[PDB]
Design a binder for this molecule. Structure first.
Ligand code: HEM
Ligand SMILES: [Ca+2]
Ligand SMILES: [Ca+2]
Length: 337
């Protein structure tokens, strides 16, 4: 099929997505940047999709429709769930764009996450299927993991949704391009790793450092001490890096950084289709841009040593990494306008 600007797709119904791509790249994402709107859009993929619970369905209760646009269509309900603090900003930015292009909310949310992540250095190229229906119901509350939930709780929730522990760790590669706004609002924009525009393994390294700093005036629910000026640390990430159920796979992204993109891609393709049958969607994956940037070598931050790493994988020692020279410079907050 002939799409706009001389582009083609095997299925004519993919053509619309090239026009959505141009709009979000130029406007929402300020010229194809891996910044604030990308980070928010990637988080939104999870907050929409994870509202899916076979455990509830099996007890004769509504379990949620998964990657169905519900968080957007029913934003008034879902964005007031506690675990959805901070999501309404991006939902309200995205909603009129989906409507103006007459594409479904569920499809738009996943598309924005896939396009956006491809803008990050060394980023993924997530599969993109289209055809999700807008006709759904609001998610039940209490289906989105919180940063104060135990590893047992997070793994049981994610397991109900369909993800093994290794896949939970892979999905958390997203925290390599990520910041917080609502855990400590005064430190809004402080990222989870030193490189929030690079889809790299710094998140996995830096979460294994000993927490030594309270970045603001106090700690807050869901937060623990951070290791580096400018960085923010979630309670949950700290625990998952160190728990025996997840610690080896956490370290695996440091030992074998080349695996991060493929494992994230596979887990995201699954997440993006919770509540859907791919065989009844169309494959518009070719619309997603090809990411740029090499696989970076993970390093220890300037001023840190191996003694600062709380190595937690029983079977295998923490890999030998280079250490950045000199003294550490505080990590810049992520810009937002
Ligand atoms: C496994 C349990 C998870 C927990 C407990 C968790 C928790 C959080 C929290 C507390 C924040 C900061 C929210 C705020 O204060 O602004 C956050 C941000 C983020 N999360 Fe996670 N998350 C998890 C899984 C995921 C998954 C599966 C993805 C997507 C694949 C994801 C993508 C992101 C992104 C990209 C951000 C950055 C948002 C921004 O910069 O505005 N998270 N997460
Ligand atoms: Ca949903
Ligand atoms: Ca990073």
């Amino acid at each position: 099929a002939k799409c706009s600007k001389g582009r083609t797709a095997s299925n004519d119904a993919c053509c619309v997505w090239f026009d959505v791509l141009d709009d979000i790249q130029e406007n929402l994402f300020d010229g194809g940047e891996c910044g604030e709107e990308v980070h928010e859009s990637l988080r939104l993929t999870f907050h929409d999709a994870i509202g899916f619970s076979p455990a509830l369905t099996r007890q004769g209760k509504f379990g949620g429709g998964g990657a169905d646009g519900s968080i957007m269509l029913f934003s008034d309900i879902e964005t007031n769930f506690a675990a959805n603090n901070g999501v309404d900003d991006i939902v309200e930015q995205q909603k009129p764009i989906a409507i103006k292009h007459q594409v479904s909310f569920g499809d738009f949310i996943q598309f924005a996450g896939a396009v956006g992540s491809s803008n990050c250095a060394g980023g993924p190229r997530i599969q993109f299927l289209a055809g999700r229906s807008n006709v759904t119901k609001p998610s039940p509350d209490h289906l989105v993991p919180e940063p104060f939930d135990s590893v047992t709780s997070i793994l049981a929730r994610m397991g109900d949704a369909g993800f093994k522990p290794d896949e939970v760790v892979a999905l958390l590669a997203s925290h390599s391009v990520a910041a917080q706004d609502t855990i400590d609002p005064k430190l809004a924009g402080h990222p989870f790793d030193s490189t929030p525009s690079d889809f790299d393994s710094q998140f996995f390294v830096e979460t294994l450092l000993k927490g030594t700093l309270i970045p603001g005036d106090s700690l807050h629910k869901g937060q623990v001490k951070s290791p580096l000026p400018g960085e923010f640390r979630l309670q949950s990430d700290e625990l998952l890096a160190r728990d025996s159920r997840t610690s080896c796979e956490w370290q695996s992204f440091i030992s074998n950084p080349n695996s991060m993109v493929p494992k994230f891609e596979r887990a995201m393709a699954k997440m993006a289709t919770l509540g859907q049958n791919p065989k009844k969607l169309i494959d518009c994956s070719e619309v997603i841009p090809v990411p740029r940037g090499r696989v970076k070598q993970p390093t220890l931050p300037a001023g840190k040593t191996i003694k600062d790493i709380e190595a937690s994988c029983r079977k295998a020692p923490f890999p030998r990494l280079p250490t950045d020279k000199g003294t550490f410079t505080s990590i810049l907050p992520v810009p937002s306008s």
